[PDB]
Amino acid sequence: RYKPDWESLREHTVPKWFDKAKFGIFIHWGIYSVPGWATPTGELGKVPMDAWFFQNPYAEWYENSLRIKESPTWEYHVKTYGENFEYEKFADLFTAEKWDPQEWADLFKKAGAKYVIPTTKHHDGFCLWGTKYTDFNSVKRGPKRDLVGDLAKAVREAGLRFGVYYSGGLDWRFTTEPIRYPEDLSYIRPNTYEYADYAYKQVMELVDLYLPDVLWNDMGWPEKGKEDLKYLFAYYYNKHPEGSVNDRWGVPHWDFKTAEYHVNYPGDLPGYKWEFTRGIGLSFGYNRNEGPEHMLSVEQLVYTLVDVVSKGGNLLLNVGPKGDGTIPDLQKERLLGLGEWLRKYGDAIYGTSVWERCCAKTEDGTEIRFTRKCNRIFVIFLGIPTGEKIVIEDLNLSAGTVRHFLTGERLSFKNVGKNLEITVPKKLLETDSITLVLEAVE
Amino acid sequence: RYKPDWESLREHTVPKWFDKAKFGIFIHWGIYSVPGWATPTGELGKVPMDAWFFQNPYAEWYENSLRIKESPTWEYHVKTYGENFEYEKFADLFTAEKWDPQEWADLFKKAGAKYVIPTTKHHDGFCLWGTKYTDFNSVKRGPKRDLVGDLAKAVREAGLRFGVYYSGGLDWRFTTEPIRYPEDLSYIRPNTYEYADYAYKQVMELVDLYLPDVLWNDMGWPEKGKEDLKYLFAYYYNKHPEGSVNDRWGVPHWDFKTAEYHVNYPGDLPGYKWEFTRGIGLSFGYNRNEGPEHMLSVEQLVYTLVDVVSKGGNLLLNVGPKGDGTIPDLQKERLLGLGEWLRKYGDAIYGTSVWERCCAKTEDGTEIRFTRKCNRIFVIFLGIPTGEKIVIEDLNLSAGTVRHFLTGERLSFKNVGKNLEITVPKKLLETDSITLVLEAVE
Amino acid sequence: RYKPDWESLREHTVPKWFDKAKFGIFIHWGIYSVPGWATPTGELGKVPMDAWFFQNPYAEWYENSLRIKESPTWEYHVKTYGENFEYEKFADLFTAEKWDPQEWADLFKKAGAKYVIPTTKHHDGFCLWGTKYTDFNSVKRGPKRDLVGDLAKAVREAGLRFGVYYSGGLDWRFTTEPIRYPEDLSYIRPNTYEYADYAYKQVMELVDLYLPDVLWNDMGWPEKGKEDLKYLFAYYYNKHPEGSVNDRWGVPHWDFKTAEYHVNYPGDLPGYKWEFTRGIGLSFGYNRNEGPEHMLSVEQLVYTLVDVVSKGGNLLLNVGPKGDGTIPDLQKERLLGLGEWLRKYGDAIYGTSVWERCCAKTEDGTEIRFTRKCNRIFVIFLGIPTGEKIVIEDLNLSAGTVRHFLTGERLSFKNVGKNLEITVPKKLLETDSITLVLEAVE
Amino acid sequence: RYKPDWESLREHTVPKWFDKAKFGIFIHWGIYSVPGWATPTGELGKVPMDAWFFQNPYAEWYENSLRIKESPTWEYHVKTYGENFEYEKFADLFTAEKWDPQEWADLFKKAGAKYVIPTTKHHDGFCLWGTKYTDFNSVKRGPKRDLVGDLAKAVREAGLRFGVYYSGGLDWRFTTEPIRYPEDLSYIRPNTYEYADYAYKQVMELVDLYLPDVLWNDMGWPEKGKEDLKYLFAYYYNKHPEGSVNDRWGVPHWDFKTAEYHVNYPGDLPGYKWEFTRGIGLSFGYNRNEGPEHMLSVEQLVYTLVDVVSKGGNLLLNVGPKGDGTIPDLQKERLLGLGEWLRKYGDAIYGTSVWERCCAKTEDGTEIRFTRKCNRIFVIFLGIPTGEKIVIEDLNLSAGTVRHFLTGERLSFKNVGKNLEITVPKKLLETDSITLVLEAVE
Ligand SMILES: C[C@@H]1N[C@H](CNC(=O)c2cc3ccccc3[nH]2)[C@@H](O)[C@H](O)[C@@H]1O
Ligand SMILES: C[C@@H]1N[C@H](CNC(=O)c2cc3ccccc3[nH]2)[C@@H](O)[C@H](O)[C@@H]1O
Ligand SMILES: C[C@@H]1N[C@H](CNC(=O)c2cc3ccccc3[nH]2)[C@@H](O)[C@H](O)[C@@H]1O
Ligand SMILES: C[C@@H]1N[C@H](CNC(=O)c2cc3ccccc3[nH]2)[C@@H](O)[C@H](O)[C@@H]1O
């Protein structure tokens, strides 16, 4: 068994299934989904942090924004709901009237996801399972239902892995003051031993009820509770060796690291397993304010996934459901576009490993990414070059054979100096969908 | 007064009464006494630990065994009680209908015990006093009575000392997973700050309500609560300097050490005060599965006590009452047999001190133990030699006079080399009961 | 950069070169090599620890055995060197007059080894390099030569990786009392702040002077200096990302685990990179009392490496040189036999990965081990079956084509129930050297 | 074995020999003995601490008093030795030219002492043995002799136990500023890691070279080195189970407590082994300014020992020798008087135990003290009553027979109310030496 200590826990590494899966779906869903509103200011890492909490683009941060008087959210709220309308009242209006978990699971599978991870409890402290440690949960209020449980059953019946997200670092049911600046995060926290217990008992409870494939913590773990993780991790791994944990615990152990929008995003092979997460738009929770101008297009999604995968990561794309449980059309379409692309090109993504280098580019600026499967090297262009003559810069191959992936057609190539030159018959070029893919066999 | 710190607490040592008492009665009694069933596999220390929790001979471990599906206990339970019958339901069936505390106290006194210590709360977390910190106690469920309190009053009225046992290290009301291997004990524990408080408040509460003569902890103390013991010990000793604590706290202080069945059992004088504990059978809680083949015989009990005492220890013999509060006949008879022996030979046991050596043996293999009272040395044979000529190996005496204990009759002896030779007139030999005892006066 | 904390050091994992190397050479060489003597009692894990330090088979523990009077070593030393000859005096006799590092390095390469690791400082605290932190080193006394340095140049010239062994945990230059029982190890240690600084400074110096490929600590790291490792490991990896460290530091981080003779030997695949270490005989240091009866045969060596490799490990085989710098023939002879088999079957060892299972066996009991390389699955029999019909118990294949590894000859096979049946023509069976090796392409 | 942790060290208790010894000799001897001078202000506990360091009666604090300019010591030093004569220079005048250890040991035995403890290193940091950790020791300077060693051989030859005094807490070789107020002690200390190692290494060395019977630390142990004591005490007891340590280390463990002049003197029995220490005069070091007016008389010494003994303690009486190694007559004279009374009444002191109470007094106020030996109760009058009818206030006896201790003469007595009345014939009263001693057998 694993013993409750970091040295011993280090014996557990990211499970194969996770490394091989490449793509998963995040779901930020909660009472904040009811107001479903945020100012779509921009991407995390590009918006100045002296303004960010005041024009927060993360709609799941509604309550914190509402607590900042005279922030767009406050004005919005008072004009739509009134001032005698507390945030907590949304728990009663969160009825998931149209929710159908098998439909969600069907959709995420058509999209190409191999795992799914919903918010079991986000910063507002509202719980989506019938926890026995708080009455502010979905069985007692709103949906009158075990959202986490019913979704885990549907995902698993679809053949996908199921994880859980928990806001261990923050819980607004234990604070009153909102976060206005990044600095506040250092003192405006539950801070109590009672909260460290609560968080431990709630994650232990999710382990016992659903034995998730992934424990996805957010915002660090209560300082008073960090030592508890030795036991929790050992407890978790002894019941599920193929389980995994991310790196937002702030303790020595983790199975894979994370990056959010621009933050900690690698420019090259990082050297450890990681996972990229972002909303389809600029928010994780649903935002009725976002239009397609705020979202990635299917093409960008595809390019995002390939960049991630070529660097050894997994993409954890977030979908933001409505309070009624339906998935906005703008999101469903992109999930589908991506699913379409994975059906054609998935063999150069799932099950691959990184190669000597992640990246290259054609003489004209088209970006290229590589993935590998034993002796097979996939060459994925971010786009489809117009001309049959492709000049790839600073690359030489020793393969001897280079095929056009989709058709399997052997192609003509030769190293011309510091470059590699290939000729792709326009008939084939016109065959690819968003990316020209080639396969080199060494 | 004692100050709340180890250096200062070290000033308190095992009280005289404890050192001089030699023999006490443990009582493991609780809702587990209702099913009163275990597989009598063998003695702790001789059973392989990779099997022990799966065929646990400690019937008080019923709930943990029940949690291991398809363990003898699980099968037993389902066939006797059914699967829709939770362990906690036994709290209602635990009615102590026939319980009479003065009868118990009468009996333990006839048995020769000088102190008594019942389980106030065992691993299953059920409490035998009206604690104000949990409703899972005997005043609210089952007996509708303060078992601890009413027993303390009866024991004390009988002239005996009263202690309390508390399972500080384990409490199954805070965990779900059972202990299957010794290793699990390192992570499957309450683990919370709330539990460390609970345990502190409950022991403080027993101190305040009953001011026990002994605080007998089991399974170590919550890591988060260890520092609390400085205050609790100081608090306890300032109200009762003659109080005492065992060594199962896992902190610097203790007044006497312990050993259970074969574990930590000394082969010779240990050098500190200790106490030996074991069931009359192989379990502490009642086990309707044990027959006399599993129990010590009165003779073995006597030999056990003498070995213990010759080594500076006290024997804490456990009796396992039934759910109705009566003491199984097989147990009552051995308590009595021992009481009979202590009435005759008690002066070579109570109030004694160890001698230069604990042990010897006759040329034919009879084992011998010694105890002392000033200039008087008691020579206790584990059995009664058949022949009038007794040759004790590797021993010389300088006493000059050796009497036959029970009759007081001066006897003939002389050191023959490396041995001591004595002649015990068969009339006298036939006078002793389970042990031939001699007394040497130096 | 790697930062000085466990969570960031977690990012560094065992380098590819180490995982692919499979076989390395350990060298326990020092002033203890001069007396070169020990009682060849038995293998670690098989000798009772109540006797072990008194009849110690590790000749490099000579100083410790010498300090125990009335130990065979003590007897031997007094009759051979005299009661007045201090252990430290051996540094003057350690002359390494016949030492030729290139010759050593060439033998290690001819032997099939990919990396070499000498003891830079063993428990007696004598250092085989010109450390500036002690005068008890090979530059000031004995050889008047930097053995570590000269050997590192030599090993690298032969194209092999060079790691360093350092005794962080013990240093008999800081103690006077010998280790007699395992328990003694818990307190007979340097214990000072001074020692913690010494060890840090000395490993830092080894990193600075030689940038080893492997930092192999032994016996734990001084408690007071444990936090220093976050700084030392970050410093080391930042200078040498492809460097590696073992698991004998007693802190959270490590790149690969270790097993010594029977201790911690895996029965099956363990889930993490590890390395097995043992001498060719029963000692690490040269022991003149060992003859062939105490050493592994070439066949046993091959069987050992294959078993280790099939379970994901590397074999770190020890060579114990003489005080004169020569490698004893019994040792050389075995190193060469192993290298002869590696030249022939290398491709089924070097650069391989574990498969689904490590082991199988034939109807008549020949043990079988598996390794993998992409689609190629190597089948290694520990020995060569006499008949042509071979029945592999409990194994099915879905490769369609199985070849004889040495010749490439396609062979006839079929799944027969829960078994795999194969026909190997005796002429091929007669061509294999110690192991029948089959290759299955799936 | 004892393990290196407080709970295991708790197992070791004060050895029997120490408890039975009752009287030991302290020796504060060092380079401070040469100036041998101090203002004999008064007893510790009676002099105001606002003045104490400025008019210090402990002549061994000379260096500290010297550093306070305008202190009587400073005045005396400048007129006697000069402003240019550094304190350290006294090591060259400390020649011990008339030193005869056997002569010292014989005087201590003739004095009734059972153990001897010299200052191996006092606050000024000068060491009376050939330590390898400093050059400021008696082998390199001054006597050019290992005083500690030579005295240990001598004391043991006389059959007495030998302990060592070590100044763990202070060492003026690591500070420049003097102690002026009690408060200063909280920060004017060595304070370094270096010092913590020094102290550990030096006590380890004393244990190794001399295996003392008592490790008597003074002034606390450096905070940074406190954890080291678990290792040092385990190491010491494992080499010498019958060894002992005092209570001036500031860690959990100790074998006996101490009281200095009025500080911590018990008013009645305390419940733990302790030892009283003081000089014969007001200093520990030799003070040429003390005359008989500053010393205890033989009678006062006897009364002191009896009071200490009746309360369970040992008396550790200080002798302060001259720089030349001779013991001043005023001191010798008192040592011999005490030994004369011990030769006579020894049996009512040596090897005794406390009784039910320590004290009583006669109708006319003579103080009475009690000691015990099994059934024998010794009654010690601090002085000899003039009349034959003696009335002991508040005491009843149930012994039936009371004898005059010296003669054995049975005496007439009877319980008269809350008192005990006894008739002692003047001829016996005239035979006692400083104390009328009665023996009651119950
Ligand atoms: C997924 C996303 N996480 C946000 C909090 N982010 C972090 O705590 C953070 C830590 C961290 C570590 C590595 C890389 C990016 C990081 N963001 C939350 O505040 C959002 O509501 C949303 O749930
Ligand atoms: C009396 C007996 N104690 C068991 C737990 N035992 C220990 O925690 C243990 C600690 C220990 C320390 C020294 C010697 C033996 C020991 N057993 C309990 O698990 C049983 O139910 C029963 O109550
Ligand atoms: C390679 C071999 N290592 C020995 C020390 N062994 C350990 O420190 C050790 C500790 C330990 C704990 C658990 C499992 C294996 C272990 N090896 C040394 O004492 C030998 O001289 C030799 O150098
Ligand atoms: C025997 C005597 N001890 C003195 C130091 N005294 C203490 O460290 C001490 C501290 C303390 C605290 C509470 C009660 C008594 C104490 N003595 C030394 O400063 C004297 O030179 C002499 O050696």
CATH of the domain at D172: 3.20.20.80
What is the rounded distance in angstroms from the CA atom of residue B262 to the CA atom of residue B276?
A: 10
Identify the residue whose C-alpha is closest to ligand 2 atom 22. B284
Cβ atoms of residues A148 and A118 within 8 Å = yes
Give the ligand whose atoms come closest to the C-alpha of residue C170: 3
Residue B267 corresponds to which amino acid? G
**Could you say which ligand is closest to the alpha carbon of residue C168?**
3
Domain boundary among A317, A350, A383: A350
Is A376's Cβ below 8 Å from some Cβ in C?
Answer: no
Alpha carbons B256 and B139: distance in angstroms, whole number: 32
Coil, strand or helix at C377: strand
In angstroms, the CA C317 to CA C335 distance is 9
Residues D168 and D111 in one domain: yes
Half-sphere CA count of D280, side-chain side, radius 13 A: 30
Instruction: Report the helix count and the strand count for chain A, using DSSP H and E.
Output: 12, 16
CA B311 to chain centre: 16
Q: Are the Cβ atoms of A6 and C11 closer than 8 angstroms? A: no
Structure tokens at A4: 């409750």
In a 10 Å sphere around its CB, with 0-12 CB exposed, 13-18 middle and 19+ buried, how is residue B277 labelled? buried
CA D84 to CA B305: how far, in whole Å? 75
Q: In terms of domains, do B317 and B362 share one?
A: no
Per the DSSP assignment, residues forming a β-bridge with D121 are D127, D166
Give the three-class secondary structure for C21: helix
Q: How many domains does chain A have?
A: 2
Q: How far is D173 from chain C (nearest CA, A)?
A: 19
Q: Is the CB of D318 under 6 A from ligand 4?
A: no
Rounded Cα–Cα distance for residues D337 and A302 (Å): 104
Same domain, D278 and D307: yes
Q: Tell me how far CA of residue C203 lies from CA of C4, C28, C189, C237, C240, in angstroms.
A: 16, 18, 18, 13, 14
CB contact under 8 A, D13 and B250: no
* Contact yes or no, D with C (3+ CB pairs under 8 Å): yes
| Dihedral angle sign, alpha carbons of residues B298, B300, B306, B312 | negative
Do D159 and D109 form a contact (C-beta atoms < 8 A)? yes
Q: Which subunits have 3 or more CB–CB pairs within 8 Å of chain C?
A: A, D
The Å distance, Cα A337 to ligand 1 centre, comes to 26
| One domain for residues A268 and A398 | no
d(CA C292, CA C330): 7
**C-alpha to C-alpha distance for B5 and B253, rounded to whole angstroms:** 9
**B193 shares its domain with B257:** yes
The answer to whether the CB of B7 falls within 8 A of the CB of B46 is no
Q: Residue C425 burial (CB < 10 Å; 0-12/13-18/19+)? A: middle
CA distances from B26 to A16, B166, B301 (A): 53, 12, 15
In whole angstroms, what separates CA D275 from the centre of its chain? Answer: 7
Q: If you measure from the C-alpha of residue A52 to the centroid of ligand 1, how many angstroms do you get, rounded to a whole number?
A: 14
Pocket of ligand 2 (CB under 6 A): B 28, 58, 60-61, 218-219, 248, 258-260, 263-264, 277, 284
Helix, strand, or coil here: D157?
helix
CA B77 from chain center: how many Å?
A: 29
* Resolution to one decimal, Å: 2.5
Is D3:C181 a contact under the CB 8 Å cutoff? no
Window 160-179 of C, Cβ < 8 Å to D: 176-177
- Do C160 and C281 fall into the same domain? yes
Last residue of a domain, one of A350, A373, A389: A350
- Any residues with CB less than 8 A from the CB of B3 and at least 6 apart, and which? B9, B234
Q: Which residue has the tokens 């029977």?
A: C262
C5 and C137 share one domain:
yes
Spatial contact of C247 and C218, defined as CB atoms under 8 Å apart: no
Mutate to test the pocket of ligand 1, among A260, A262, A276, A317 (most ligand atoms within 8 A of CB): A260
Q: Are C254 and C293 in contact (CB under 8 A)?
A: no
| Residues 6 or more apart in contact with residue A79 via CB below 8 angstroms | none
The answer to whether the CB of D56 falls within 8 A of the CB of D66 is no
Pair of tokens at residue D180: 């002026």
Q: How far apart are CA C266 and CA C273, in angstroms?
A: 11
Per residue in D373-386, is it b (16+ CB within 10 Å) or e — as a string?
beebbbbbbbbbbe
Which of B6, B12, B270 is nearest residue D6 as measured by Cβ atoms? Answer: B6
Separation between Cα atoms, residue D3 and residue A25, nearest integer Å: 54
> Could you give the CA distance from residue C121 to residue C29 in angstroms, rounded to a whole number?
9
Identify whether residues A189 and A282 lie together within a single domain: yes
Cα-to-centroid distance, D332 and ligand 3 (Å): 59
C106 and C217 belong to one structural domain: yes
Q: Which amino acid is at B25?
A: I
Residue whose entry in the numeric block shows the structure tokens 């918010």: A119
Give the mutation candidate from A2, A3, A9, A11 for the C interface (greatest C CB count, under 10 A): A11
Residues C177, B399: Cα–Cα separation, whole Å = 42
Nearest CA in chain B to A236: B187
Distances (CA, A) of A172 to A130, B303, D69, D267: 19, 66, 64, 60
Domain CATH number, residue B370: 2.60.40.1180
**Overall size of chain B counted in residues:** 442
| Closest ligand 1 atom number to CA of residue A60 | 21
The experimental technique used to determine this model is X-ray
Q: Which residues in chain A are closer than 8 Å to B180, comparing Cβ atoms?
A: none
Q: Which residues contact A439 (CB under 8 A, 6 or more apart)?
A: A348, A376, A377, A378, A379, A402, A403, A404, A405
What is the C-alpha separation between B277 and B43, in angstroms, rounded?
Answer: 12
Asked if residue A392 lies in contact with residue A380, where contact means CB atoms within 8 angstroms, the answer is no
How far out from the chain centre does Cα B334 lie? Answer: 15
- Cα D194 to the chain's mean position, in Å? 30
Domain boundary among B321, B350, B379: B350
A268 & A391 share domain: no
Cβ contact A159:A106 at 8 Å: no
DSSP A349: T
Contact (Cβ atoms closer than 8 angstroms) between residue A215 and residue A167: no
Spatial distance between the Cα atoms of A250 and A223, rounded to a whole number of angstroms: 9
Nearest Cα of chain D lies from the Cα of B273 at a distance, in angstroms, of 9
Cβ pair C193:D224 closer than 8 A = yes
Cβ–Cβ contact D46 with B under 8 A: no
Per residue, the 3-state secondary structure of chain B, as one string, reads CCCCCHHHHCCCCCCHHHHHHCEEEEECCCHHHCCCCCCCCCCCCCCCCCCHHHCCCCHHHHHHHHHCCCCHHHHHHHHHCCCCCCHHHHHHHCCCCCCCHHHHHHHHHHCCCCEEEEEEECCCCCECCCCCCCCCECCCCCCCCCHHHHHHHHHHHCCCEEEEEECCCCCCCCCCCCCCCHHHHHCCCCCCHHHHHHHHHHHHHHHHHHCCCEEEECCCCCHHHCCHHHHHHHHHHHHCCCCEECCCCCCCCCCCEEEECCECCCCCCCCCCEEEEEECCCCCCCCCCCCHHHCCCHHHHHHHHHHHHHCCEEEEEEECCCCCCCCCHHHHHHHHHHHHHHHHHHHHCCCCECCCCCEEEECCCCEEEEEEECCEEEEEECCCCCCCEEEECCCCCCCCEEEECCCCEEEEEEEECCEEEEECCHHHHCCCCCCCEEEEEC
Length of chain C: 442
Question: Are C153 and C209 spatial neighbours (Cβ–Cβ below 8 Å)?
Answer: no
Examine the domain organization and report whether A196 and A310 are in the same domain. yes
Residue C335 phi/psi, 5° resolution?
-60, -40
d(CA C257, CA C265): 11
Question: Pairing relation of β-strands D401-404 and D437-441?
Answer: antiparallel
Q: Which of B349, B19, B7 is nearest to B213 (CA)?
A: B19
**D208 three-class SS:** helix
Please indicate, yes or no, whether residues C330 and C425 belong to a single structural domain of this protein: no
| A235 neighbourhood in chain B, CB within 8 Å | 177, 187-188
- Which residues of chain C make contact with D196, given a CB cutoff of 8 A? 193
**Residue A403 C-alpha from the chain's centroid:** 33
DSSP element (H, E) containing A260: strand A257-260
- Structural domain of D362: 351-442
Helix (H, G, I), strand (E, B) or coil at A208: helix
Tokens of A218: 């957010």
Residues with CB under 6 A from ligand 1: A 28, 58, 60-61, 218-219, 248, 258-260, 263-264, 277, 284
Residue B45 neighbours by CB distance under 10 Å: 13
* SS3 call for A3: coil
* D positions 393-422 inside 8 Å of C (CB): none
For D117, half-sphere exposure in the C-beta direction (CA atoms, 13 angstrom radius) is: 28
Please indicate whether residue D264, judged by its CB atom, sits closer than 6 Å to ligand 4: yes
Q: Name residues whose C-beta falls within 8 Å of residue C220's C-beta, 6 or more positions apart in sequence.
A: C168, C169, C248, C249, C250
Q: What are phi and psi of A181, to 5 degrees?
A: -130, 155
CB contact under 8 A, A252 and C374: no
* CA C237 – CA C246 distance, rounded (Å): 13
The answer for residues whose C-beta is within 8 angstroms of residue D56's C-beta and 6 or more apart is: D38, D39, D41, D64, D65, D71, D73
